[PDB]
């Protein structure tokens, strides 16, 4: 019964080509609901889900001012980190921020997250206790001491347990019809003989939400972890997700294998046989 | 809602 709200920020420096590229997105669970693109014409925080469109002009003015402020922050962070690491002014670098909060089954605050990354590597992260930081190197130690000086973990824990969860609850009740739904996966199998030596069984799971799913193959009850291909859970484009798991089988033994699908939308895990 | 604070690295 856990629910989450996340904000993702990506800033990429374009040296000698103007300002950095800034893109922000907000998620509730696996549903995107806001976006902002530095290069878009609107220069505004835009809706990407119906249940957020009902918010008033104060909300969108506010989130636009804040997201532009985070755009400025990351712009400065690119120059700052370039200094920390003594890097040339000609290379293009990337700062990424991610922060949000989780509420539990009782709809109270459960967990908080807030962390940065430079060029795809961890820079600094807020620890689970929401009171201390994790610094990977000298540069991150600098930031850590700066934030420790300004009591950042205090203001941030106050936000994560306050405004963050309050409006996560508001979004969950406004988007009750879609955010609190559960689309169970539609499943089936396919068989493609790659030879007389062996054939390919493929187990399909389609149109399911949320994206958390588990697919396993079994040969006579034992787990076929090896000889099993597993594809990455991909988006369908309509708000649902897809995933398939394939296994190679000697011809004539297709009835010996079994696909087991596990998803929170199913009351009992599914068992699929080629018999 | 986003966090109000400006937080620099």
């Amino acid at each position, epitope marked *: 019964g856990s629910h989450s709200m996340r904000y993702f920020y990506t800033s990429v420096s374009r040296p000698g080509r103007g300002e950095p590229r800034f893109i922000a997105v907000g998620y509730v669970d696996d549903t995107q609901f806001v976006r902002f693109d530095s290069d878009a014409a609107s220069q505004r925080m835009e809706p990407r889900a119906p249940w957020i469109e009902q918010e008033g002009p104060e909300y969108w003015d506010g989130e636009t001012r804040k997201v532009k402020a985070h755009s400025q922050t990351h712009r400065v962070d690119l120059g700052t980190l370039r200094g920390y690491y003594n890097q040339s002014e000609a290379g293009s670098h990337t700062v990424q921020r991610m922060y949000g909060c989780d509420v539990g089954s009782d709809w109270r605050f459960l967990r908080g997250y807030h962390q940065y990354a430079y060029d795809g590597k961890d820079y600094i992260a807020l620890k689970e206790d929401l009171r201390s930081w994790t610094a990977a190197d000298m540069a991150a130690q600098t930031t850590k001491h700066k934030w420790e000086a300004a009591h950042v973990a205090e203001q941030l824990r106050a936000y994560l347990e306050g*405004t963050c969860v309050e409006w996560l609850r508001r979004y969950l009740e406004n988007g009750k019809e879609t955010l609190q739904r559960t689309d169970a996966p539609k499943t089936h199998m396919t068989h493609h003989a790659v030879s007389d030596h062996e054939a390919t069984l493929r187990c399909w799971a389609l149109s399911f939400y949320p994206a958390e799913i588990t697919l396993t193959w079994q040969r006579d009850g034992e787990d076929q972890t090896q000889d099993t291909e597993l594809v990455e859970t991909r988006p369908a484009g309509d708000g649902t997700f897809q995933k398939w798991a394939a296994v190679v089988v000697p011809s004539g033994q297709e009835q010996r294998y079994t696909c087991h699908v596990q998803h929170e939308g199913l009351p009992k895990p599914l068992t699929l046989r080629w018999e | 809602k986003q966090w109000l604070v400006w937080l620099f690295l």
Partner: antibody
Amino acid sequence: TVTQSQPEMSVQEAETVTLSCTYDTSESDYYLFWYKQPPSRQMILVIRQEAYKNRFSVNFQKAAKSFSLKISDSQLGDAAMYFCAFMDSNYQLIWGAGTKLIIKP
Amino acid sequence: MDAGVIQSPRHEVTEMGQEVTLRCKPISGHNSLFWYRQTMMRGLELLIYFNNNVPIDDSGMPEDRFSAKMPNASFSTLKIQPSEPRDSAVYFCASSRTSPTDTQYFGPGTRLTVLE
């Protein structure tokens, strides 16, 4: 908007005076400030208070939206124009009308 | 250093049509710079404020008569060209360490009187 009800106040030296200030905003995270401007025109901060948390102190009532400045043991050097300020997602100081504090020796 | 926010000139008396240049050097480690002006009728008015030399908000700036710039982290300038009597005011420069939410420290101000 910030409201400082009485635009002027007189207090006897070595006595305590309380300047009222109330604001009105829907936004859920904000900042409050008390600034002081003597006749020298030099704006100086007196007290800062964030929403989540000397002779000068403040009664901060989040319920009634009250941010009152309290000066105990008035000193002649406190006579000045006291402004109550407030900031939200607009990231711009929003100024009250101001209260002129006069200290009678 | 004996220093906070620094403004020059302290006073400026000039005639209309003349160019007016106000200079400000913020506190050393401060990255946000603010331009205010104060009058009797209108009170305090935020004209423009920068952060890390980037102009964040200039909505308080009048149009095509006022222009502010900040070429260094340690210097900003506000220019009125041409000046008019209605510009008469006390233009304050302020600064803060990192963001507009941080305590702002104000300068002594420039007393501008544009006469007819």
